[model samples]
Target: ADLDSKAKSPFVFKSAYYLSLYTKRRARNLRQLAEGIRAADPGVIFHHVFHVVFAKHLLHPYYTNDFARWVGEELNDDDLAIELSSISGAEPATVEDVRRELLAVLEPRADERAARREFVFVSMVPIVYEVGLKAETLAEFLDAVAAAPPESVAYHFVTARVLYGNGRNDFSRWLVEEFGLTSAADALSRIDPLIYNDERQLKSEVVRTLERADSA
Candidate 1:
């Protein structure tokens, strides 16, 4: 798939934040971009949308605080909101610091929902935190996978994207070695980094490719 072209209608916008970056649309702010993206694809998971929003603007203290407040008030995740609130005015805080705070609340445990949340968080980290395959973060992810049920294919798929986006395509081979996911790992590793710019397209193609590989 061409990175320059827009992804098809059926796909969700990774985030309005990302849409504004990719498109000619003149969004006044992150919130507006989010509203526009929501209008275009109402089914998008807002928490994940905010993930992108926060990730893209992690450096802006005011924006980060405002977004954290929005999540608490709008999203009703008070625990998360409070966590965000704690770091609101701390301009000196780094993305790593903020990531740690959020993770402490989200508690990426060995379960379905937590795994998904971790995947979203990890994907954003590579972009937002400006760190690729941070050893500690990757360890946490692997720990979750080890504790999860043996049949959990979702984590593998999510890990594939996270690793690839972080320029750690070689880690997909670890999936094969560790999980015996030979075919899926192959499909995932083949994905071009160019498509990572469009999160939806990257995920869609990865899933489609994985399915084809499974059936082959």
Candidate 2:
């Protein structure tokens, strides 16, 4: 995404906080986490970058104190399998299996209720903390996914717009507020980098959107 932004402060603060959270040790933790996850399910294979990025996001849900100690602990393939499979209400065939049956059901039918719930949960997890939501932005993100097509990149953007827009207005009414951002546009600029590597994958759309929001 283009670095130039009329509202850059949100992005600036977000980057600073992100760096503060991830250290060399943290990065290593993510790698080991990925290894354990991959051993549990080979279908999750991506570069080390994916694991580290995912680990950072996962931290939002983890209790920081517990995480500090468990950061690099070795995970059993069975434990990882149970965790992933539990999401889909599936009992995986084995500890190392990808639960491909479950993933396949959701991946192909992006409009399925299962997929919507999953996507929304992932999207909401970060915003709920950063924006400080009480009503469940995670559920709202999934509701949006349920209402729209998950395969469309625009769907994610629209979900983000609803999320930040609602999150900005009132914490008590909506259970969240966008405190740091100068505007909704700037607030989203802060969010995208946390959830996305904007410079890469889905670049044309994501990067351009960031640029447009920044300029706005």
Candidate 3:
């Protein structure tokens, strides 16, 4: 009995210091030391445990589908799970569309506002990569990005691309200043949009340039 109690302890602990505050926060919460670790689903808890372990080393996989499935089947939140399932196969742009649809359900009922905003912004990357200078669309996306807490890799990535694509060198330069990414941001400012016809190539180079700076 004593040995079994020791083995099933929920007060697990781990140390992690990742660059992304979102990932770090999620990892910390899943560590069992923070939550009311119920014995109801040790397997579920274990899944999250391994999730954080891998999450600390690398970026977390977009788990929208997985989350919906778990909530529907494991946690028995059928309505939410069903709604999330609708967005399971959603693409980047479409994911934001679905996020809004789900937000209508989540926001008024639940108060995880910060977490929700973070999830939506991170998931916006693929769409943001492709989203160009459509006035209305860009405005909507920018409003959402600006609403999120700053210092996210995704936020910086989208903002830099949007501002650059819109021919806003001043703002792009400011982004560099804001983040203190002087060298890389300067290089980003030098990106000749006319040289690269396909927007994807431009976004790709933008990411590569920033990643090199991050590595350094």
Instruction: Report the error of model 3 at residue 216, Å.
Output: 50
Pick the TM-score winner.
Answer: 1
**Superposed Cα deviation of residue 212, candidate 3 (Å):** 42
Q: Clashing pairs in model 2?
A: 120-142, 134-175
Candidate 2 — which residues are off by over 4 angstroms?
1-14, 17-51, 54-73, 85-199, 202-205, 208-216
Clashing pairs in 1: none
Q: Write the per-residue lDDT of candidate 3 for residues 68-173, one digit (tens) a residue.
A: 4444444455676556445421111222333344444444444222221221111111113322221122223233333332223222333233322332333244
Model 2 C-alpha lDDT per residue in residues 181-207, reported as the tens digit of each score = 344334333332223332233334443
TM-score, cand. 3 vs. native? 0.24
Q: Give the residue spans of candidate 1 off by over 4 A.
A: 1-175
Counted clashes in each candidate structure: 0, 2, 0
* Ranked by lDDT, top first: 1, 3, 2
In candidate 1, what are the lDDT values of residues 61-124, reduced to their tens digit?
Answer: 3223433445544454566555655542122222333444444444432112211111111112
Query: lDDT of all predictions, in order shown?
Result: 0.34, 0.26, 0.33
TM-scores vs. true structure, each candidate: 0.25, 0.20, 0.24
Q: What is the overall TM-score of model 1 with all chains considered together? A: 0.25
